Amino acid sequence: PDLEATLRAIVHSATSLVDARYGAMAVHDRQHRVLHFVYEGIDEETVRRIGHLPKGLGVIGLLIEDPKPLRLDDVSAHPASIGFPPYHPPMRTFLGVPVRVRDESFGTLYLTDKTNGQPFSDDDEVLVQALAAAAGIAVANARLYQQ
C-alpha cells in the first residue's frame, strides 16, 4: 504493498508532469538503510543488468545529509557526485528534493533528463516539492501503522 503503491503514484506524477525520462524515490531508515526504492522510466532488462540497488551515495547521499532541493544541469559535474554503476542509463540533468514532514526527513524524490535536454526549472522544483510533501505525510503515517 500500500505505501509502495502510493509512493509509485507520486513518482509517476512527478516524472510525467515535469516530463522527465526517469524518476525515483528512495526512502531510508534512520541509519540510512533503504526501505523502499520505487522508480520509473527504466526497463526490467536494464534493471537486471545494473544488479544492485542504490545505497544512497553521492548526490543522493548529499540530499540525505542536507535535505533541501538540488537542481543540476549535469549531475556528474557536482563535487559530491559518486558516478553511475556499470549498465546504468546515462543521466545528466537532475532535480532532487526531500520527502519529509517538519519532525523528520525520510527520503528523496528525484528526477533526471527532462525532455529535449532542458534543465529543470524553478516551476519544476516547486511542483516536485509539493508532491514530495504529500509522500512525506504518507511515510509519516506508515511508520505509525508500523507500529
Residue stretches of the annotated binding site: 88
- Name the minimum Å distance from CB 111 to a copy of itself: 14
CA 139/CA 88 separation, integer angstroms: 28
Decide if residue 64 touches ligand HEM (CB under 6 A).
no
- Name the minimum Å distance from CB 16 to ligand HEM: 13
What are the beta bridge partners of residue 22? 112
CA 119/CA 110 separation, integer angstroms: 14
Give the residue among 88, 94, 96 at the shortest CA–CA distance from 43.
Answer: 88
Decide if residue 145 touches a copy of itself (CB under 8 A).
yes
Residues 109-138 vs ligand HEM: string with x where CB under 6 A? -x-x--------------------------
* Residues 105 to 134 in contact with a copy of itself, rule: CB under 8 A: 123, 126-127, 129-131, 133-134
Q: Residue count at the site for Ca ion (CB under 5 A)?
A: 1
Using the minimum distance from each CB to a copy of itself, give the nearer residue, 4 or 89. Answer: 4
* Residues 2 to 21 in contact with Ca ion, rule: CB under 5 A: 19
Q: Are 112 and 22 in contact (CB under 8 A)?
A: yes
- Three cell numbers written together for 96: 532532487
What are the beta bridge partners of residue 112? 22, 94
- Nearest residue to the partner Ca ion, using Cβ: 19
For the chain, the distance separating the N- and C-terminal CA atoms, rounded to the nearest angstrom, is 16
What are the beta bridge partners of residue 60? none
Which residues sit at the interface with Ca ion, rule CB under 5 A? 19
